């Protein structure tokens, strides 16, 4: 199945909130549109370049990354309610390593892979 | 101190038996021994030099590499039975990002890293 998981338990409300804040600063940042990634977390994968710089902008302001701003996959998966643990593994097993000339384009990859590898737990706020 | 699962179903028979002619070539060409082989196996983490550059010589032979010879972990997974694929997750989950100066010290960083995660499931040959 496929179809986006949304309900009272999943996404884990508590990492929602925390992420609120991330969300305001890198929306301002990017001039992503609210829209473009509610459609990408819960719709079709779409192309869009702000998007994948907003996908960057969070990954810098949750403090997962190396020191060349790459996303260090281990700090992310510690960073996540042990309560997703195990679907967060699965989804990122065949992300490991991204491909892209920019740290926007490597997010966006990151993004894509996860919502290819595992739709229906896939999601952006 | 756990014990190494040793019975007539794990480690695989299958995977222990396509082994065999890669430990000899790279036993051959590393020239270890295999009493350091069995030992890392079943007993204490040790360093040995020649080891550490079987163990790199193993994931060559595998074709599990990228093309600079770094182990490629998705590749590996894959080489793996099905049978091990929950156990490999668990026992890899902390050794994404391998350290070392050689190919041979970075192979060593791996499988430290894959015991110490867990002794009961990790094996050599
Ligand atoms: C969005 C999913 C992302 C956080 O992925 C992981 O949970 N991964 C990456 C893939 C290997 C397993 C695990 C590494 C844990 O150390
Ligand atoms: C938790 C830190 C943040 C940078 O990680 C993420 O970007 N995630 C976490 C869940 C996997 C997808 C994505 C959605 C977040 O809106
Ligand atoms: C001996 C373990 C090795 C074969 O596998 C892994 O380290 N994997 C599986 C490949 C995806 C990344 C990682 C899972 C991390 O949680
Ligand atoms: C199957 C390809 C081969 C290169 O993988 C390994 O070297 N493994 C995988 C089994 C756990 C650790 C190690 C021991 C095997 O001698
Ligand atoms: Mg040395």
Redesign the pocket.
Known sequence: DTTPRRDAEYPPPELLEALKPLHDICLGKTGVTEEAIKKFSDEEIHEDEKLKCYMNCLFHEAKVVDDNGDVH??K?????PSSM?D??????????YPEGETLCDKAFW?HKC?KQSDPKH?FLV
């Not at 992310?76 to 996540?80: I, M, W």
């Open positions: 996959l281990e992310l998966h510690d960073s996540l643990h679907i967060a593994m699965h989804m990122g097993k065949r992300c490991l990151l996860w896939y």
